[PDB]
Amino acid sequence: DVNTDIYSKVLVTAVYLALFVVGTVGNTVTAFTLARKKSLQSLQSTVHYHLGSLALSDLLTLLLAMPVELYNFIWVHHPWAFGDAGCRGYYFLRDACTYATALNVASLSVERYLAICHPFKAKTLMSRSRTKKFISAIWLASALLAVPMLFTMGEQNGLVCTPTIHTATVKVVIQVNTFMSFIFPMVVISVLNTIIANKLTVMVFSMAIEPGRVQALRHGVRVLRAVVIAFVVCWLPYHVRRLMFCYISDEQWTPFLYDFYHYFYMVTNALFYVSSTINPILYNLVSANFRHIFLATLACLSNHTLSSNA
């Protein structure tokens, strides 16, 4: 008994498919781009690790969420395929992917802050092995704090997928989820990005992107602020909707909030998916070498010195 226009659902599905294919293609070409090729390893710039991890997180989010989410919620909603175990594992995977994305963006911000604001204090407290360990630890923490999704989810009886835990337990789980997924990442993303932006503004640098070659950043301030004010537009509606799932009265006593929440789900998942696509676009708009290599990879689809005698 869900009230939604068929034309609106079809348009949403088409937009979702287009965004999915665009994001998958972009993240795949990005992943092949930061393959480092040969003889291009600067051994001092570790942004390739974080960029590749973020690209992998976004691509995994898309692949492990969109095909299941469409055919389970938007296209058809009454039946289910994988049973309770699958319906819990899918939510666990979604939670892990979202956590990996948020933590990877925060870690990229932290690494950039360490490199720019305190270069003297950066090399002492950073290395390639430490960066690899950090990249692994982000995914480990994502899985560890996403297992609550496995614990609380279940299949009741209509093939619903609502969590089986009590209202208090579900509310607490959603509270800690939204906390560790938005509040902690976003404060770092805001303060560190602002610090980098003001440190770059006063400077009004050099990036050796190759042996004997250099480059500059075209919009290392506008994009540096966009990466902040775009995560209050992509994460905030989705997290506030999943918070309004519970802990706020009881659906406000059966108003039009039913259709309101269905449209909320559609819009919020669209905005959630937009973040998985925006990143490579911002990657091509800040680094010229990256844009060149990205496009090249996507294409796979005076007299003379004489002699005399003394």
Binding site: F73, H77, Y91, T162, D250, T254, L257, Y261
Partner: peptide
């Protein structure tokens, strides 16, 4: 309450 979806 209408949790048909999350």
């Amino acid at each position: 309450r209408r949790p048909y979806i999350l």
